[PDB]
Structure formats: structure tokens, C-alpha cells
Amino acid sequence: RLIYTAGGYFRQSLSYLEAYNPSDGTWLDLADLQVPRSGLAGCVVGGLLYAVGGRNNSPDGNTDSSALDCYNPMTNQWSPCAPMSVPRNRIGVGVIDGHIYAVGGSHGCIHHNSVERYEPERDEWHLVAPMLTRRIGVGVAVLNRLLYAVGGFDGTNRLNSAECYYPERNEWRMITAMNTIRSGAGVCVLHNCIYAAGGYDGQDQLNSVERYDVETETWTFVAPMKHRRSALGITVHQGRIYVLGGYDGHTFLDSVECYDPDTDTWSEVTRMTSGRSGVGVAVTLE
Amino acid sequence: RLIYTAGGYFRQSLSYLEAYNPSDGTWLDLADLQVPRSGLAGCVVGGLLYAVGGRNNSPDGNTDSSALDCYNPMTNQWSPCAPMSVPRNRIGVGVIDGHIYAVGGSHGCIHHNSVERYEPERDEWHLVAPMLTRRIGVGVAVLNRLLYAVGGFDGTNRLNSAECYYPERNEWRMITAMNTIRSGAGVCVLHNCIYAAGGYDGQDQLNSVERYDVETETWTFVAPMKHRRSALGITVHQGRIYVLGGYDGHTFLDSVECYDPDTDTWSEVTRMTSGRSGVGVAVTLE
Amino acid sequence: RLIYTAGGYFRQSLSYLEAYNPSDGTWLDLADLQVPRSGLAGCVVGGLLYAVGGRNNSPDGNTDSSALDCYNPMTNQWSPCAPMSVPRNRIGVGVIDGHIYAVGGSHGCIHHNSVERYEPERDEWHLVAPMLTRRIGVGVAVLNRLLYAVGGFDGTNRLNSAECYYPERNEWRMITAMNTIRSGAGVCVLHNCIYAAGGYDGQDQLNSVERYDVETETWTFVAPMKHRRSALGITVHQGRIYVLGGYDGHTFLDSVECYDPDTDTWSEVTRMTSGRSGVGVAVTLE
Ligand SMILES: O=C1c2ccccc2C(=O)N1C[C@@H]1c2ccccc2CCN1C(=O)[C@@H]1CCCC[C@@H]1c1nnn[nH]1
Numbered sequence: 001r002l003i004y005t006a007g008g009y010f011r012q013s014l015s016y017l018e019a020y021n022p023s024d025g026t027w028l029d030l031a032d033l034q035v036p037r038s039g040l041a042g043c044v045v046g047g048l049l050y051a052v053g054g055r056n057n058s059p060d061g062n063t064d065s066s067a068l069d070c071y072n073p074m075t076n077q078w079s080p081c082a083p084m085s086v087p088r089n090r091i092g093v094g095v096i097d098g099h100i101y102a103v104g105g106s107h108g109c110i111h112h113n114s115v116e117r118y119e120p121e122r123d124e125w126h127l128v129a130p131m132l133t134r135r136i137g138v139g140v141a142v143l144n145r146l147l148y149a150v151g152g153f154d155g156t157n158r159l160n161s162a163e164c165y166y167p168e169r170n171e172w173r174m175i176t177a178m179n180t181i182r183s184g185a186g187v188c189v190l191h192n193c194i195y196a197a198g199g200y201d202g203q204d205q206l207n208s209v210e211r212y213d214v215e216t217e218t219w220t221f222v223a224p225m226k227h228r229r230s231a232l233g234i235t236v237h238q239g240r241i242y243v244l245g246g247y248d249g250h251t252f253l254d255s256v257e258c259y260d261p262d263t264d265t266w267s268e269v270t271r272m273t274s275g276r277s278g279v280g281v282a283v284t285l286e
Numbered sequence: 287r288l289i290y291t292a293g294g295y296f297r298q299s300l301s302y303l304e305a306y307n308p309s310d311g312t313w314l315d316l317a318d319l320q321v322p323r324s325g326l327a328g329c330v331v332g333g334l335l336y337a338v339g340g341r342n343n344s345p346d347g348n349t350d351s352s353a354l355d356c357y358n359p360m361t362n363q364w365s366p367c368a369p370m371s372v373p374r375n376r377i378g379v380g381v382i383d384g385h386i387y388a389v390g391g392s393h394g395c396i397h398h399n400s401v402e403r404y405e406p407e408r409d410e411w412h413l414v415a416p417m418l419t420r421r422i423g424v425g426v427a428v429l430n431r432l433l434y435a436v437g438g439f440d441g442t443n444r445l446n447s448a449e450c451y452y453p454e455r456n457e458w459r460m461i462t463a464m465n466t467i468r469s470g471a472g473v474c475v476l477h478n479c480i481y482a483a484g485g486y487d488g489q490d491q492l493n494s495v496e497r498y499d500v501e502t503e504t505w506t507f508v509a510p511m512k513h514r515r516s517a518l519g520i521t522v523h524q525g526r527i528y529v530l531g532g533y534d535g536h537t538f539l540d541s542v543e544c545y546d547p548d549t550d551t552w553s554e555v556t557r558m559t560s561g562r563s564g565v566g567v568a569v570t571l572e
Numbered sequence: 573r574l575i576y577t578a579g580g581y582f583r584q585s586l587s588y589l590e591a592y593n594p595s596d597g598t599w600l601d602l603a604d605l606q607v608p609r610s611g612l613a614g615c616v617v618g619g620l621l622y623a624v625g626g627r628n629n630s631p632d633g634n635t636d637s638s639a640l641d642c643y644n645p646m647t648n649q650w651s652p653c654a655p656m657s658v659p660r661n662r663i664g665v666g667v668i669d670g671h672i673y674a675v676g677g678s679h680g681c682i683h684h685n686s687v688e689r690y691e692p693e694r695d696e697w698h699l700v701a702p703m704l705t706r707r708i709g710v711g712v713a714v715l716n717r718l719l720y721a722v723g724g725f726d727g728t729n730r731l732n733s734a735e736c737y738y739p740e741r742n743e744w745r746m747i748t749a750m751n752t753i754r755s756g757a758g759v760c761v762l763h764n765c766i767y768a769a770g771g772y773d774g775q776d777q778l779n780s781v782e783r784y785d786v787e788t789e790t791w792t793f794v795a796p797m798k799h800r801r802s803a804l805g806i807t808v809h810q811g812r813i814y815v816l817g818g819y820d821g822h823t824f825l826d827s828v829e830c831y832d833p834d835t836d837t838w839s840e841v842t843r844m845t846s847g848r849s850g851v852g853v854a855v856t857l858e
Pocket residue numbers: 009038039040055057089090091137183184230231246247277278
């Protein structure tokens with residue numbers, strides 16, 4: 001239906017909200033964020049777009065965000081929701097049973113292993129069991145009612161490790177680590193596999209993509225992206241992964257590539273209006 | 287039966303070969319290595335002690351070693367054997383079916399994922415399938431005729447990841463990662479479980495100890511060591527782990543702690559003649 | 573007109589500046605470099621010879637160079653220019669529109685993919701687009717106002733890959749890879765074709781030479797050199813390639829071969845005053 005892209009960074013933190021339509025390839029110019037921010041994460045619950053966490057990198061100063069803002073598509077306006085317990089810059093998020101999980105992120109020099117859950121019915125955040133590892137630039141994916149924290153950065157080492165959360169048991173456990181170390185990678189779920197595209201391994205931006213099969217418990221490489229990129233927006237729409245923007249250790253990308261799992265190929269389908277990195281993206285449900 | 291300690295580091299790379307008898311608590315001052323080195327690994331095959339890889343850190347310069355030297359307890363003599371294909375400083379080693387596996391390590395700035403095997407009868411090294419990850423300061427453990435590479439450092443990031451080698455199939459496979467990131471940890475096998483004691487997580491030296499059960503595929507913490515230590519010697523003697531020396535953030539340890547798995551307790555049983563880190567340790571077989 | 577040879581290595585890093593006249597076959601002994609260096613690159617802009625990057629391998633210690641020095645033929649004198657942003661040993665250089673491009677190279681352990689441009693009239697360096705691959709011992713050629721980075725070493729593997737820079741667009745594209753892997757090869761342009769002579773493939777020094785046709789996008793072998801050589805000086809003078817010195821496996825070459833494209837034959841036309849490798853070579857324009 002539509003692929004949102006909220007915020008991002010180019011010279012400073014951005015306030016752009018734009019929506020891409022895969023059918024005709026048009027870009028909608030929607031209402032801008034109240035506060036500019038990069039390193040945020042986007043998710044859609046009910047029929048509202050949620051902008052979680054982030055950081056406002058401006059010439060005047062840098063401020064980490066604990067703000068949850070809710071975009072109503074009908075009115076084309078943003079409405080503040082209950083803020084998180086702590087600011088979370090470079091955050092990952094996943095949705096289970098209509099509840100938003102705010103995973104990891106940073107507050108200045110404090111790297112979070114803590115995770116908290118938002119209940120939209122109550123407008124209320126509540127902390128859950130923390131991760132085994134501190135993760136910023138973490139990628140999150142939801143599969144079989146289980147949340148996966150994939151890769152990231154613990155303040156010293158970038159991570160190839162991943163861990164699975166069990167909502168019913170309220171506990172974390174380590175799974176098989178990735179083949180490549182990835183911080184700020186695009187993580188999503190397509191069919192019955194966890195995907196991890198792009199990222200930063202400590203010295204190079206990555207174009208390699210690998211997927212995790214839950215039953216075999218093995219990470220397998222697939223066709224790499226055309227442009228290597230970190231801090232990229234990722235989204236699945238009608239059986240195909242879409243990756244939007246990012247940073248290639250150099251230029252802020254406007255490129256948007258699409259992955260077809262049947263053919264195992266990447267192809268640039270469009271461009272964003274301007275180059276940016278660290279965007280929060282989410283698809284309109286259904 | 288003796289616990290050998292070869293080489294090590296204190297202000298410069300050491301040449302010490304010393305042997306500890308756990309029965310009476312005595313120390314034997316044996317013949318020194320012909321070339322001093324730290325970051326080496328020790329192993330015992332067919333009644334002979336082998337010193338593998340390492341580096342000679344001296345005031346006159348630094349040289350990485352590809353040397354395999356063989357110590358005969360009967361003659362108290364070091365005799366050179368066939369050198370490895372490439373130098374391997376901060377190496378890990380394991381023994382399967384009388385063959386010595388040289389795993390990972392570094393040569394100057396090259397970090398090895400490559401692995402090679404030594405055949406004592408032929409005095410020959412041959413490369414096998416390389417690891418999925420480049421690892422230096424890697425811990426090696428042999429269990430059920432499979433070789434496990436644990437933790438380490440890839441040149442940028444310290445690792446909690448672990449992978450298992452299959453000699454018959456000649457292939458590596460990533461297993462469940464550790465709870466803690468460990469580079470230069472003491473890795474050994476006790477009662478059908480892989481132990482990972484100490485190490486360096488990128489910031490602090492560790493005193494925590496976790497073990498891996500092969501069937502459950504889970505890492506579990508046990509009682510921590512009294513002293514934090516990285517680049518530590520390790521071996522098993524009559525159902526108990528012996529850790530020797532290491533680096534705790536400033537002092538080079540001479541302490542030697544012993545782990546009793548029944549009581550789940552650590553106790554300092556003896557001291558080495560001088561403090562050191564990066565030693566090659568192996569026990570006399572049987 | 574003269575073929576300059578600056579620096580080089582034999583036992584230690586050299587300070588020689590010598591100039592060969594192809595007409596009468598004489599050698600000119602010009603003013604030595606202020607600082608000895610090998611792994612540098614030479615180029616001529618506006619009647620001035622430039623010595624870029626390199627390293628001073630001395631008995632007292634090894635130091636990588638970020639220095640740009642300018643030789644004035646009128647005064648027979650070297651003058652320091654603005655240094656590069658980072659030291660670059662085994663550097664490659666080319667010139668587009670009177671601007672010197674510093675491509676890749678190493679700073680001790682760091683292998684650069686970054687590229688920076690020097691403006692002689694301003695005496696300023698500015699970073700441009702970094703390469704898709706990190707390359708040390710990289711050969712550079714300019715053709716149709718596009719800069720080509722060929723072969724080299726990425727810190728792990730020696731490369732047969734090549735890539736093309738687009739100054740106006742400020743981006744890099746990966747072109748067709750070479751038939752042979754070449755690190756430290758002599759790269760130049762002749763009759764609208766990119767040549768890659770000699771180099772090191774990981775095991776042996778090479779005498780084979782292959783050229784790239786830009787329209788057909790194919791690498792084709794030509795007559796090989798008489799001597800195998802890596803880290804060789806190279807240039808083009810009156811429709812013929814001149815390769816100077818290098819390393820063949822044990823002996824530092826003083827040989828200077830010349831390639832005639834019409835006959836497709838190499839021939840030793842002269843010798844340098846002493847054998848050396850890793851020199852910077854360039855021709856007085858016109
Ligand atoms: O885009 C860049 C970038 C540009 C230039 C230099 C360094 C970086 C970088 O690390 N990135 C990625 C990084 C990143 C990584 C993972 C997830 C989100 C993001 C947001 C973008 N980003 C950034 O680093 C932001 C953009 C670059 C300025 C610094 C910004 C920042 N500083 N502290 N937090 N953010």
C-alpha cells in the first residue's frame with residue numbers, strides 16, 4: 001500500500017515524512033516531524049505510524065530522544081504519545097500482539113541492553129527482561145511470536161551475535177551468530193526466515209545479505225545488494241524486501257533496492273527525494 | 287604427571303619451560319626454549335610436548351613465529367620440527383587422533399581464519415577447511431572428535447561467537463555464541479562440556495566462567511575465578527581445571543587456581559616462580 | 573624530455589632522483605630527496621615533478637609518509653608542499669585537469685580505500701570518493717578523463733579486480749577484472765588502452781602483460797617482459813612503455829625494458845645506476 005520513511009540524516013537530522021507506493025512508484029509528501037531526528041525506528045500498529053527514539057543532530061547541539069510520536073494518516077498530523085523510560089538513539093523495534101518493543105539504543109555514552117514495551121490501548125511503557133548484550137544500531141525481527149535482536153554495537157565491539165526473546169517466558173537466549181558482523185543493518189522477516197542486509201563491520205560498509213532459518217538454525221548468504229550501506233531503512237511488501245537509503249562510508253544514499261526471493265536478485269526500483277541515512281521505515285499493514 | 291608451562295610474557299617474551307606436579311606441589315625447572323615467545327600454545331602427543339606458534343616480543347624487535355618445537359622429557363631437550371605454513375601469534379591448538387591442529391592466530395597484521403594440521407609420524411603440515419571467522423586469541427577445545435573454535439578477535443571486534451569443525455566432512459559450522467565476549471580466554475574440556483574461563487571483552491579482563499553443553503546447545507555460567515585474567519594457560523588434570531597466570535589489567539599473574547566441578551568452587555593451589563601471560567600449557571597424558 | 577625516477581628501495585629506502593633521456597641514452601644525476609622513501613608515486617604537473625607518499629625503511633625505524641614534495645627542474649631543488657590527510661605507502665597516483673589524485677596505499681596496518689585530490693594552485697588536499705575496494709600497491713591510469721584503479725592488495729587477498737572513477741559524478745564503478753592477480757604492477761595508458769605490466773600474484777613475480785580495451789571491456793595478454801618484476805616504475809614516452817627496476821624474487825633489478833606496440837616486442841634499452849624497487853616514475857610532459 002505505502003512504505004513510510006520517517007526522519008533520517010543529511011548534514012543534520014531530518015524531519016521528512018514521505019510515503020512510497022510500490023504500484024505506481026510515486027512519492028507522497030506528508031506532514032513533517034515535530035522534532036527532527038535520526039537513528040529512529042518506524043512501526044505500524046492498528047493504522048498509525050509510530051516514530052520511536054532517535055537523536056536530533058543539529059548545529060546548535062545534539063539531543064537523544066525518548067519521544068514516541070504517532071502519525072495519524074487521516075488528519076496528516078503528528079500527535080505525541082507517552083515517552084520511553086530512557087532516550088534511545090540508534091534503536092530497533094518489533095511488534096508482537098499490537099505491542100511495540102523498544103530494543104536497545106544509546107543515551108549519550110550509555111549503551112542499552114534494556115528493553116521496554118508500549119501498550120497502545122493504555123499509552124503506557126513497561127520494561128521487560130533486558131538483553132544479554134548491550135546493542136545499539138540493533139536490528140529487530142518478529143517471527144513465530146518471538147522477537148530477535150540481531151547484531152549491533154556494544155560500545156566497543158560490533159556484533160554478529162543474535163538473541164531471541166520469549167514474551168510468554170520473559171527471557172532472552174543466544175542463538176547462532178551471523179557469518180558477518182553487522183551494526184546498523186537492515187533486519188526484517190520474509191517468509192519464514194530472518195534477513196540481515198548491509199551494516200557496518202568495524203571498518204567497511206557492507207552489501208552482503210544473509211538469512212536465518214529457524215528450524216535448521218543456520219545463517220545463509222544470498223545475493224548481495226548493489227550498493228553497500230549502513231543505517232538503512234528496511235521493509236517487506238508483498239513478498240519482497242525493500243531497502244531505503246543509508247551510508248556507504250561516504251555518500252548518503254537516495255537509492256532504493258528491491259529483493260526478489262524467487263529469482264535471488266536485487267534491483268533499484270526508485271529513488272528518494274534526497275539522500276539520507278538512519279531512517280525509520282514501516283509499511284502500511286495488509 | 288606434570289602440568290607444563292612454556293614461554294609467556296613479562297616485559298619481554300619468555301623462554302621458560304617449567305612443570306608442576308599436582309600431587310606434591312613441586313615445580314621443575316626444565317630446559318628453556320631455544321627462541322623466546324608469547325602467544326603460543328602447548329599440547330602433548332605421544333609423550334612429547336609441542337610448542338606451537340607465538341611471537342618473540344623483545345627490545346630489539348618483534349617477530350611472529352611459525353615454529354613447531356618438540357620437547358622430549360627423557361632427554362630434557364628441545365628439537366625443531368617442521369614449521370607451519372604461516373606464522374601464528376596468539377594461536378589456539380587442539381589434538382584429534384594424534385594430529386595437532388593449528389587454529390587462527392596472527393602474522394603481523396594478517397588475522398587468520400585458516401587452519402592447518404600436523405602429522406607427527408610424517409613431520410608434515412597440511413591446510414584444512416578454513417574457519418567461518420578470523421580469530422586470534424582463540425580458544426580451542428576437542429570433544430567427541432570435533433574441534434571447537436571459541437571466541438577470539440577478528441582484528442576489529444572481540445568475539446563471543448563459536449564454531450565447530452568436522453574432521454571427516456572437513457567443514458566448519460557456527461554454533462550457539464557465548465553469553466560473554468571473550469578474547470584470550472582459557473578454553474578446555476571437562477566432563478563432556480566446553481569450558482571458557484576468563485578472557486578480554488574489549489574493556490575489562492574477565493573472571494567469569496561459562497560452559498557449553500553439546501546436547502542442550504546452551505552456555506551456562508559457573509563459579510567465577512578469584513582473579514580476572516586474559517591470555518591465561520589452561521589444562522585439565524584428574525577431573526579439575528587448572529588455570530595458570532594471565533593479565534588482570536596491569537599485573538602479570540603468578541597465581542594458579544583450580545576448579546572443582548562437584549563443589550563448583552575455585553581455589554588457589556600454588557604460584558608460578560614468576561608472573562606471566564600468554565603461556566602455552568599442556569598436561570602429561572593419561 | 574626525461575623519464576624521472578625518484579626514491580626506491582635497496583637494503584634501505586633510497587633518496588635518488590635520476591633522469592633518463594631516451595634520445596641519447598644518458599642518465600642525469602639530479603638533487604636527492606630530502607627524506608628517503610620507497611613505495612611512493614611520481615607525477616608531473618605544469619613542468620614540476622611531484623613525489624607522493626611512500627615509506628622510509630631505514631635501519632633505525634620504519635615511518636610511513638604523508639608528504640608531498642615538489643621538484644623544480646629549473647632550480648634542481650626540492651620544496652615541501654601540503655601533506656596528505658593520511659600517510660600512504662605503496663600509493664598509486666594519476667592526474668586529471670592538473671589535479672593530483674592520491675589513490676589508496678597503507679598507513680602501517682590500515683589499508684586505504686580513500687582517495688584525495690591535490691590542487692597545485694591552492695596547495696590543498698581534499699577527500700573525494702573512496703574506492704569500492706581497499707587497495708595497496710595499486711596501479712593508476714587516466715583515460716578519457718576517468719581515473720582507473722587496478723589490482724593491488726586489500727589487506728587479505730591480492731586483487732585482479734579494477735574500478736573506474738568518474739570525477740564529475742564523484743563515484744566509483746567496478747569494471748571487468750584482469751586475467752591475472754596483480755599487486756605492485758606497473759600500470760599506464762597507451763593508445764587508448766590501460767596496460768598492466770608485471771606485479772605479484774601471491775606466489776610469484778610476474779612478467780606477463782595485459783591491456784584493457786575500454787569499449788570491448790576485455791583484458792587481452794600481450795608479449796611478456798623479459799624479466800619478472802613487482803613494485804616496478806612505469807611510464808609512456810613517444811608511443812612506447814618504459815618499465816624501470818623492481819623485484820623479481822631475490823634481486824633488485826636495474827634493468828629498463830621498452831615495449832613497442834606495433835611490433836609487440838620488449839627490449840632492454842638501458843640500465844639504472846643501481847638496482848632498486850618501489851620507485852616513483854614520471855615523464856616531462858609533451
Ligand atoms: O550515516 C552515518 C555516518 C555518516 C558520517 C559519519 C559516520 C556515520 C555513521 O556512523 N553513520 C551511521 C549512524 C547510524 C548507525 C546505525 C543506526 C543509525 C545511525 C544514524 C546515522 N549515523 C550517525 O552516526 C549519525 C549521522 C552522522 C553524524 C553522526 C550521527 C550520530 N551520532 N551519534 N548517533 N548518530
